[PDB]
Amino acid sequence: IVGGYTCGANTVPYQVSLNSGYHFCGGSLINSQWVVSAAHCYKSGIQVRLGEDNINVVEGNEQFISASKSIVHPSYNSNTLNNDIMLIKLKSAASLNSRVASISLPTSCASAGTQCLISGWGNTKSSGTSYPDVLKCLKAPILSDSSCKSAYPGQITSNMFCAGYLEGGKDSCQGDSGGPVVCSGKLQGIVSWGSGCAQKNKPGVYTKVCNYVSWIKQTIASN
Ligand SMILES: [Ca+2]
């Protein structure tokens, strides 16, 4: 997160870190046994780390649980990043509490102008590299479909939306991928892509979660 703020420990209780020896992507806990993340975050050997603030210190609220199964969206295209969504089942159910909690799925899509909370352990510089140890947050609005498409000609599908600031300086970044965009208490996006980070006229692009709720629910029901 570029241009954000320190969230506070366990104030984003659905935020997870995906770990393969090191943090490499975020994710969102959607029930005791399932995480949603970005398909471009897929790898084997994932440990899901819940209840994290400092990803380099054991602080006392962590739950570390191996993935038992990963499911990349059937229509994920890694070239275009269309359908940049994947589900991860945990080998055991998380113990839900005040600091480890699921986030609601949307019942309807969000609109342009809605403020959202984006979070992650990604890069904090736009012309540099600095990775935080503690969770960073950004409040950002959803941008209109027309401004999103104008920012990124020929690249925005109906499964993507833009959020952030066309002026630059405030965005998600490398290492935030897969993490949440929550608007009025609903998971509306997944950190997906963008040109650089926090660049003028190049807002963040997010997977449009509301298009996938049917798939999510049926997949959970059968796995
Ligand atoms: Ca920790």
List of domains in the chain: 1-12+103-210 (2.40.10.10), 13-102+211-223 (2.40.10.10)
Q: What share of the chain is helix, strand, coil (3-state, %, to 5)?
A: 10, 35, 55
Ligand 1 centroid to Cα of residue 72, in Å, is 27
- What's the Cα-to-Cα distance from 92 to each of 24, 47, 48, 72, 106, rounded to whole Å? 21, 12, 11, 20, 25
Is-catalytic flag, 28?
Answer: no
Give the position of tokens 């975050």. 41
Whether 172 has a binding-site annotation, put simply, is yes
Query: Please, are residues 204 and 122 in contact by the beta-carbon 8 Å criterion?
Result: no
CA of residue 218 relative to chain centroid, distance? 21
Candidates 126, 95, 116; CA nearest to 182 is 116
- Tokens coding 212: 């996938």
Following DSSP, what letter does each residue of 68-129 receive, concatenated? EEEEE-TT--TTT-TT--EEEEESS-----SSS---BPPSS---TT-EEEEEESS---SSS-
Of the candidates 37, 53, 73, 84, the residue annotated as catalytic is 84
Rounded Cα distance, 105 and 97, in Å: 18
Rounded Cα distance, 71 and 128, in Å: 34
Expressed in Å, this structure's resolution amounts to 1.5
Candidates 129, 140, 146; CA nearest to 172 is 140
- Its sign, for the CA torsion 43, 45, 50, 54, is negative
Query: Please, are residues 144 and 163 in contact by the beta-carbon 8 Å criterion?
Result: no
Is-catalytic flag, 177?
Answer: yes
Candidates 205, 115, 191, 125; CA nearest to 157 is 205
> What method was applied to determine this entry?
X-ray
**Regarding beta strands 186-193 and 160-163, do their DSSP bridges make them parallel or antiparallel, or are they unpaired?**
unpaired
**Regarding beta strands 34-37 and 136-141, do their DSSP bridges make them parallel or antiparallel, or are they unpaired?**
unpaired
